[model samples]
Target: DAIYYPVGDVDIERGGPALEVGEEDVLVARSFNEEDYVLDTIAQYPNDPTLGKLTFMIDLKNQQKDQNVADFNGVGKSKLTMSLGYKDGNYPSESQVPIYTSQDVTAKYAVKLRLKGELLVSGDEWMIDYVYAQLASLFQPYPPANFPEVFMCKGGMKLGTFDSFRRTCTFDITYDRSDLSFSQLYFNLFINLAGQKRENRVRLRIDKESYFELYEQSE
Candidate 1:
């Protein structure tokens, strides 16, 4: 494993489906080796990462506060510091997370996990505002006075919102995954925020316009 982490949690309803500590919830990692991570760590956001490596991930729904559209959730790019979590947890440190390995990268077994991590985000206001305008066009009439209520908007409605911590230097995140796989090439069962199940593969209703924005950026 490129990264070795101690998974800690008994799953739940919001972030997961009752992942208990030490059972399906202990020592989860994010790599087959040093050169690769579990690509597509996020099923909703495509394989592209807006910022930071997708590691120790825990995402059930969009961390951003959108109503229906799927978007990046907690612990994403921020100014000085980004955060990761579950309910209210932080990204475990790699320095303290001792390295370990798997006997088989292509094992035929169930793979369930709940993990998190953090990184540094940029401090440029133009970039921050640029991101803000891109992902959100919705806000509440009376939101909780903790984070900014940036939301994903569509058809005069809202999808997800990117609430924050200390807008200047924090990209705190919280999010979940529960699955079983015989192998990446054989059999797999993946579930989405809507409890939709897919065996190996499935098509989706996507936001063409939303994707267009990313395509423009990458190009």
Candidate 2:
């Protein structure tokens, strides 16, 4: 029964892994695995140090960046929002605890998020121009690979979708809290912009077919 949400729902530090306009100049970048942004849902689940394969997904819902800069477009067409958690669940922020769980199978969490403003072109370039330059050593993206290890900051989760404009990205984390630390360093650098010039605007809304699925351990 749950699938989407509004802008007032999900949008975290640096807009939760989705790049925006103001980010390029408004603020300095940080590590996703840092105190501000990190993903360790396993710690929040209600179980005896649960052990299973947890999956995180990001979907695009009428989201995109403008082409020209110095212009303001309709908020809806210039903003993207998403709810983060299992089955469109909620965690709020790093300062809070993630309690979105499932005993039936809708175990995927869809934590809501909102990525507003213009999306920078060349998703990969955004990383080279921002990520490493901002959070070094503590967050590593050296020799960016299409592998999971590439996005691990202090050993966290980050999906680098440097190409696709509107799409869904999912990663399976088959470990526990100490097993990994979701990196906000490289994860939040994703800016899906299909523009030519520059304009900080987005079709603000939650992603579709998204989920943060967690599988039960072996019995």
Candidate 3:
């Protein structure tokens, strides 16, 4: 048997990524690559020898500006990239290792992600007005082609699911000290929002709290 945490196992780290304007308002323009962003959240897995498999879910939503700001409601689309990796210890100086490996049927090393989806904004009071007001609004009413895209990177025997409507990803990563060497993991989420001048923000929300579970069986 293994521990199964329901909704409180994950915690957000300080100073992961925040968007704010100068001394005055909250709207701003900025760009970020994978290296520029910090580790966003940590998953405290069970420090048990019996731990064999681990699974978790992550929810991402947007923080929309109040009162229908032009750029906030009508900006172009954005794509998100999220990664889960672990280090030997909690220190930043420790070498980070991938939760799942990417290799050929033969062998290779390349860093890639598991899930992909179009980012959506929150449906706030004013957002409803904008969604119905504009004829061809940026708040798209239809789903994107191949709505939730799941990629199969070689060698890492893992499983993943992306829910485009709910903006959540459920990932399954096997346990191996030779690979991760630790019971804790961190999320490195990257978002590329279109339009150079518009303010863009992605926030994670959960019901009460979100969590993960460890299993004793292996696939």
List RMSD in Å for every model shown: 21.2, 21.3, 22.6
Best by TM-score: 2
C-alpha positional error of residue 62 in candidate 2 after TM-score superposition, expressed in Å: 15
Question: Model 3 has how many clashing residue pairs?
Answer: 0
lDDT of each: 0.20, 0.22, 0.21
lDDT of 1: 0.20
- Native RMSD of candidate 2 (Å): 21.3
Worst ten-residue run, lDDT, model 1?
Answer: 210-219
Instruction: Please provide, for model 3 over 1-219, each residue's C-alpha lDDT reduced to its tens digit, 9 standing for 90 to 100.
Output: 322212212221121122221243222211112211111332223343222221222222122222333222111122233212111212222223222222223221111112222223332211100000001111111221111111111111122233443333333332111111112222222221112221223333221111111111111
Per-prediction TM-score: 0.20, 0.21, 0.20
Candidate 2 similarity to native, TM-score:
0.21
The sequence of per-residue lDDT tens digits that candidate 1 reaches over residues 1-219 is 222222111121221132233433333332211111122222223333343222222221111223232232221221111123212113335312111222444432222222221112223221111111111111111121222221111110111222262112112222222222211111101111112221111111111111111110000
lDDT of 2 by residue, 180-214 (tens): 12222122222222223222222212232221111
Candidate 1 stretches with Cα past 4 Å from truth are: 1-16, 22-125, 129-169, 180-219
Better candidate by lDDT, 1 or 3? 3
Model 2 misses residue 208 by how many Å?
Answer: 4.2
